[PDB]
Amino acid sequence: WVIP
Amino acid sequence: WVIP
Amino acid sequence: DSCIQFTRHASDVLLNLNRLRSRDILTDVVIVVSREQFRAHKTVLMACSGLFYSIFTDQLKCNLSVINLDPEINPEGFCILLDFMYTSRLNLREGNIMAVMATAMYLQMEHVVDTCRKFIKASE
Amino acid sequence: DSCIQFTRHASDVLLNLNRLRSRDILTDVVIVVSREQFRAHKTVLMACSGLFYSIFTDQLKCNLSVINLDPEINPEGFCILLDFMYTSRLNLREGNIMAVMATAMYLQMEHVVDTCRKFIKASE
Ligand SMILES: O=C1Cc2cc(Nc3nc(Cl)ncc3Br)ccc2N1
Ligand SMILES: O=C1Cc2cc(Nc3nc(Cl)ncc3Br)ccc2N1
Ligand SMILES: [Cl-]
Numbered sequence: 554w555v556i557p
Numbered sequence: 558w559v560i561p
Numbered sequence: 562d563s564c565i566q567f568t569r570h571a572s573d574v575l576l577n578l579n580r581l582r583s584r585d586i587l588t589d590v591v592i593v594v595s596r597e598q599f600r601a602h603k604t605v606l607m608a609c610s611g612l613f614y615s616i617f618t619d620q621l622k623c624n625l626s627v628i629n630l631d632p633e634i635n636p637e638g639f640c641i642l643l644d645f646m647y648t649s650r651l652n653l654r655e656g657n658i659m660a661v662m663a664t665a666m667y668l669q670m671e672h673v674v675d676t677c678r679k680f681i682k683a684s685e
Numbered sequence: 686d687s688c689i690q691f692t693r694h695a696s697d698v699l700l701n702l703n704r705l706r707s708r709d710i711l712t713d714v715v716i717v718v719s720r721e722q723f724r725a726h727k728t729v730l731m732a733c734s735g736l737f738y739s740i741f742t743d744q745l746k747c748n749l750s751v752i753n754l755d756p757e758i759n760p761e762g763f764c765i766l767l768d769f770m771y772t773s774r775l776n777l778r779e780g781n782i783m784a785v786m787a788t789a790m791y792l793q794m795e796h797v798v799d800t801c802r803k804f805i806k807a808s809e
């Protein structure tokens with residue numbers, strides 16, 4: 554999971 | 558396009 | 562093999578599937594969550610959820626145009642997860658994390674369940 | 686928004702759609718290319734091809750279970766492109782590049798047309  |  | 566690969570292809574396909582969803586093009590099922598209705602593509606739901614995979618591979622349920630979810634399922638939690646299926650983006654907030662995790666467990670969306678458990682463990 | 690994103694989601698969705706294709710699950714159209722037949726999902730074809738997008742948004746053609754391609758279309762070129770749609774991998778070879786490019790132009794698959802033109806320009 555990432556900060557888009 | 559890339560070499561997978 | 563000696564194939565070449567187009568890096569953005571999977572993302573572009575999903576973006577187009579979401580565009581079809583937004584315009585209600587070739588949607589083939591309604592998911593009923595209490596008083597709310599959500600139109601979707603059976604194939605996308607199966608590709609994202611262990612529960613929908615099991616439902617639409619059933620020889621009788623594969624032909625249903627309406628699927629009623631368990632009454633304990635929160636429509637907002639379902640909406641957030643349906644958006645995630647079509648976009649890869651999850652709108653996880655302190656106010657919705659419990660409903661989202663409960664909905665992802667029911668829908669069998671393992672990666673969503675995993676990030677919810679981690680975000681909850683961080684706030685305790 | 687304040688969304689989080691699961692990097693591998695789009696790739697995982699496409700992998701599952703290809704698994705459904707391989708097991709012939711919920712395929713809803715046959716594409717006829719001369720003597721050959723290819724089963725597929727209308728939504729995936731529309732998401733990958735400007736031609737299929739135009740075909741299945743047509744109020745009459747959206748309901749067809751069989752689509753016949755132009756007789757000039759090569760079944761192997763179509764097969765290579767159908768595999769690309771479901772996997773992001775393109776099996777581009779000296780022996781098939783002309784058929785693949787001609788098929789991608791007809792299908793309106795701009796990125797495939799682009800790499801074919803570049804590979805051809807390199808060999809001249
Ligand atoms: O957390 C998750 C997400 C998910 C998706 C599917 N979908 C499919 N799985 C397989 Cl193996 N083939 C085709 C399809 Br469509 C099955 C289980 C799960 N569990
Ligand atoms: O080279 C390409 C690939 C492609 C795909 C689509 N598909 C869609 N386009 C739009 Cl804007 N919305 C929903 C869908 Br499905 C249209 C044109 C093209 N040209
Ligand atoms: Cl997931």
Ligand SMILES: [Cl-]
Nearest residue numbers: 794795796797
């Ligand atoms: Cl393309």
